[PDB]
Structure 1
Amino acid sequence: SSHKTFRIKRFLAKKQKQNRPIPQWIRMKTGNKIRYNSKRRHWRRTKLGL
């Protein structure tokens, strides 16, 4: 809702920053073993805990 408390807004803010693709140059690191971002979240598929 528009009416949200500061703790909730600070929680959604972290989830917003965290939901971004991995950098392109990460794959070039030695012994990378990461293909994509496995923790990607979509708003309409998986709902946040809170």
Structure 2
Amino acid sequence: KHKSLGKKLRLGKALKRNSPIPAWVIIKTQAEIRFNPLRRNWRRNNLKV
């Protein structure tokens, strides 16, 4: 799989990561239930190129 190093070499908001809230933040904020409002799925959602 041939990635021209703008997506695989720079890693972050360009082909990296989709993660839940860290567990210690959920305890600290005492939140009733704490979600990531930007969660997506590889199969249903779409990632820009």
Instruction: State, as a whole percentage, how many aligned pairs show the same letter.
Output: 48
Could you say what the CA RMSD is over the residues aligned between the two structures, in angstroms? Answer: 2.3
Unaligned runs of 5+ in 1: none
TM-score by length of 1: 0.63
Would you identify which runs of 4 or more consecutive aligned residues in structure 1 move more than 6 Å?
Answer: none
Structure 2 length normalisation: TM-score? Answer: 0.64
* Residues paired across the two proteins, number: 45
Segments of 5+ residues of structure 2 without an aligned counterpart are: none
Q: What is the CA–CA distance in structure 1 between the aligned matches of 2:41 and 2:7, rounded to whole Å? A: 18
Equivalence map 1:1-50=2 (5 Å) = 2-9=1-8, 10=10, 11-12=14-15, 16-17=16-17, 19-30=18-29, 35-50=34-49
Task: Compare the two structures and name the one with the higher helix fraction.
Answer: 1
